Every structure is written in structure tokens, then in C-alpha cells.
Amino acid sequence: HHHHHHMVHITLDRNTANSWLIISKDRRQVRMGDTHQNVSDNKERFSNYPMVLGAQRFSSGKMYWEVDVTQKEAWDLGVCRDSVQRKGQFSLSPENGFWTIWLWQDSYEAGTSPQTTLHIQVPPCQIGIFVDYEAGVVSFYNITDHGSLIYTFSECVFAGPLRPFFNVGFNYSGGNAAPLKLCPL
């Protein structure tokens, strides 16, 4: 792809984080802690899942960023409406304000309703995310495989400002402790 020149510097918003997440000083890395991280509760925090938002809000234009997923067994990545539900149980779907892909139990799927099987021959270590606000497109790229297309959501109805979205996943197995990292431009 040729989206690299729309690169944006994403930082994580601590105030939205599940209370078990540990965000680095530079706000560019996040991992699951083994306990509550001693923060107060607030109405912004994702309560049920190990999720966090980027601080940046997008309402126009073309945006691109990259995320490192090396050695993780489970994660969700993409973009969501600023006003998505934070508390309780919910599914990742465009109807609920999410445009995401994930890894779970050795398969990759797009967060459509119902979910869509992805066809990845080279397991990605870094994922590129492209948003075209005006066109209503969210695309995902396999940086490990020379930028090959993973998935395109088209005819997106954003219906609000967008935020970068992250889920580091649970670590019930002891094999999913590694962080998500925002990769340098």
C-alpha cells in the first residue's frame, strides 16, 4: 500500500484504560498487569475487558498508524466511535460503533456481525490501520508480509468522532503477557 504518508502519532489515554492495564511513560505501549493498578474508577474506563482508547479524535481526513503484536495469542485492534459503551458486556460490531479485527485461538477474524474469517498465510508481527473518514473506509495491512491487505470495512457509518481502539486480551494461558506497542514513524 501507499498510505504511509498519512502516518499519525497515536498516544494512549490512561483515563479510558481498564484498571488492570499498565501504560508506559511515553503512552505508546500497554500490557495486562497481574492485578488492579491502583487507579480510581471513572465513567470512561472499560470495565469488563482489557481495552483502552487512543487520545486522538478523528472527524475528517486520512489517518494511518502501526501496532506491534509480537508473540501475543489474543488481541483486538481498530477504531471506534468516541461514544461506545464502556461498562458491561458487548460485542465488537459496526452496529455497536467498532471497526476492528482480532486474533483468538490461532484464527484471525474481522469484527463484522456475524464475524468474518480472515485469510492470513504469514502471521503478522505488526498491523497497519488506515482510516479514510470521508470515504467511510477502515483497512488493515500485514506489515510482516510486505503490507498485504488483511481486510477492508467499506460503507462505514462512523456517526461520530473516531478514536484508535486496543484490546491487549486476557492472559489466562500465561502465553499472552506481551504488550501492544505503537510503532515509530
Ligand SMILES: O=C(NC1CC1)c1ccc2c(c1)OCO2
Ligand atoms: O458501519 C457499518 N457497516 C460497514 C462497516 C461495514 C454500519 C454500522 C451501523 C449500521 C449499519 C452499518 O447498518 C445499520 O446500522
